Design a protein around this ligand. Structure first.
Ligand SMILES: *[C@@H]1O[C@H](CO)[C@@H](O)[C@H](O)[C@H]1NC(C)=O
Ligand SMILES: *[C@@H]1O[C@H](CO)[C@@H](O)[C@H](O)[C@H]1NC(C)=O
Ligand SMILES: *[C@@H]1O[C@H](CO)[C@@H](O)[C@H](O)[C@H]1NC(C)=O
Ligand SMILES: *[C@H]1O[C@H](CO)[C@@H](O)[C@H](O)[C@H]1NC(C)=O
Ligand SMILES: [Ca+2]
Ligand SMILES: [Ca+2]
Ligand SMILES: [Mn+2]
Ligand SMILES: [Mn+2]
Lengths: 237, 237
């Protein structure tokens, strides 16, 4: 089976998408994961967007695990340079029927008081105690304490292109981040066996968070917009 | 609501119980959680016994959480005093349809690669890197790194009586361990809010494991028998 879908731009009322929390689709065809009021991003926000149908990542019957490729472009604009923007966005795969986890440095996917399995790639903008120098991309398996990290220099307000490919044969998850206006290229990879971590069917989508009010700094925010998104996966057996 | 059950001793073919892995009920009416062949407890063992029907620990419509009490007697016999007996047993509450996680110091409940929520009381006999002096009673919330612990001196081969009470009105989980032959009393308590951790309906039961072959020490074993077990829960709403 080969599932595929492509969004060159999002539209309002889109059937194949499931918005959660603050996430909404603007008139301009941009998916804003977090809250922006008349051009200014707000703190204390969290939002997610999921493809409305689950995809089969592997089969128990055959033991085969699906390969997949996903591509998307995003934009993170940081208006208040000081004291520190927050928190970041992530592409994630998690079991179906899940609710938004905690925000902040958890991105709306990780809840320490009610854990569930998840694999996710993060573009992190705030340096928590469990984090290395920001910004950095990170591969996360069940936790926000990344297995692998690589720092990057954000194109503030610019466009970022991302390619994430998973090869069943090698169990390699490889991630590409490009900032076209800047010419910069960032690469990061790790072995992840989707079978020992996730159930047969999952949900794919994005999650983002802006500073938590418990920080007392309202200038800890930024936008987390998605411009386009396509996904393809193949399960032989 | 008020579910209630009691086992003075276990009878083979017990319909209200649900054994998993190595766990089994012997002729003498004892429920042996881990493997013992002709009186000799063997390493590399993991077993679980769960009550057949799921209990409702809380209500979303009303917001009411249940109070419960459970009492049981166990026996841990350590035939090989050296190099070190292992690993222990636990009473635990987890989401329905759970699967026997990792053995060893994870007691057949925790599974790092595929987390799920659980609340448990362990009686730990092996000192892992995350553990303090053994043996000790410990309260576990979603992980084997206890929130609160207390040490105890085991009556090797003897009978232990345990009382576990949860008061919804205060979220106090209180634990009592008595070794009758010795006259010793160990007590431990912590604040635990079942609503922030578990779903409305869970499964209640026991789990135990003997040393893992990864330690390369066949002597890291002991018995983990359950003599009797009563349980009462009351959900006002
Ligand atoms: C932050 O947002 C959450 C959910 O939208 C709300 O509970 C909270 O009161 C909001 N405001 C502040 C200042 O915390
Ligand atoms: C230990 O026991 C398990 C389950 O019975 C088995 O699969 C494994 O190969 C055993 N290994 C050793 C060294 O005993
Ligand atoms: C294993 O236990 C037996 C019984 O006490 C003992 O004779 C043997 O040499 C022990 N092995 C170690 C490493 O202590
Ligand atoms: C926050 O952002 C505004 C807008 O840039 C700036 O004038 C202010 O002093 C910044 N610093 C803090 C600590 O809020
Ligand atoms: Ca962070
Ligand atoms: Ca231990
Ligand atoms: Mn991070
Ligand atoms: Mn312990």
């Amino acid at each position: 089976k080969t599932i595929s879908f492509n969004f060159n731009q999002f539209h309002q009322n889109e059937e194949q998408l499931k918005l959660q929390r603050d996430a909404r689709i603007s008139s301009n065809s941009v998916l804003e994961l977090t809250k922006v009021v008349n051009g200014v991003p707000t703190w204390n926000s969290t939002g997610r967007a999921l493809y409305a149908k689950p995809v089969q990542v592997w089969d128990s019957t055959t033991g085969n695990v699906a390969s997949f490729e996903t591509r998307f472009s995003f934009s993170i604009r940081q208006p208040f340079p000081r004291p520190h923007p927050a928190d970041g966005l992530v592409f994630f795969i998690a079991p179906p029927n899940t609710q938004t986890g905690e925000g902040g440095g958890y991105f709306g996917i990780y809840n320490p008081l009610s854990p569930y399995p998840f694999v996710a790639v993060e573009f992190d903008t705030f340096r928590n105690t469990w984090d290395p120098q920001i910004p950095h991309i990170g591969i996360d398996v069940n936790s926000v304490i990344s297995t692998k990290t690589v720092p990057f220099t954000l194109d503030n307000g610019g466009i970022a292109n991302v390619v994430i490919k998973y090869d069943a044969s090698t169990k390699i998850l490889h991630v590409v981040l490009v900032f076209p206006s800047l010419g910069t290229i960032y690469t990061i990879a790790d072995i992840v066996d989707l079978k020992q971590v996730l159930p047969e069917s999952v949900n794919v989508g994005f999650s983002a968070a802006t500073g938590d009010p418990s920080g007392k700094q309202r200038n800890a925010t930024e936008t987390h917009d998605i411009l386009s998104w396509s996904f393809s996966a193949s399960l032989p057996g």
